[PDB]
Amino acid sequence: KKGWDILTKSADMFINDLTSRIDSGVNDVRGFFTGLASDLNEWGGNVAS
Amino acid sequence: DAREWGTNLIDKFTGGIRSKISGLRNWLSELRNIGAEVGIDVPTIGGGG
């Protein structure tokens, strides 16, 4: 039982990386919403001025 | 950049017009004060004549 955990040291860390791949989700929307805000602050702030 | 060009070059025109709108109504007054020489330096009607 000691001499095998090395074989899930692999399985479980792949699932950790898959959390990082799922971490595309929040970083996408966080990027999109603040990108939209930046464009709206641009066209708004520019057309206003 | 827009805040520059949309105002500085515009004041190439407005800086001129700021003088125009007054300057036109200045001449519409200038024809009067110097028109008035026809009375103000013609006391001959009441004195010298």
Smallest Cα–Cα separation from B35: which of B27, B25, B44, B23?
B27
CA B2 to chain A, closest CA, distance in angstroms equals 7
Q: For residues A40 and A33, give the distance between their C-alpha atoms in angstroms, rounded to a whole number.
A: 10
Q: For residues A4 and B33, give the distance between their C-alpha atoms in angstroms, rounded to a whole number.
A: 110
Q: Tokens representing B19? A: 């003088």
Count of residues making up chain B: 49
Residue type, A42: E
Q: Tokens representing B2? A: 């827009």
Phi, psi of A44 (to 5 degrees): -60, -60
Please give the C-alpha separations between residue A27 and each of A3, A19, A21, B17, in angstroms, as whole numbers: 39, 12, 10, 53
Q: Tokens representing B48? A: 């010298």
CA A25 to chain B, closest CA, distance in angstroms equals 35
Contacts of B3 (CB under 8 A, 6+ apart): A46, A49
Q: How was this model experimentally determined?
A: cryo-EM
Quoted resolution (Å): 2.4
Q: For residues B25 and B18, give the distance between their C-alpha atoms in angstroms, rounded to a whole number.
A: 12
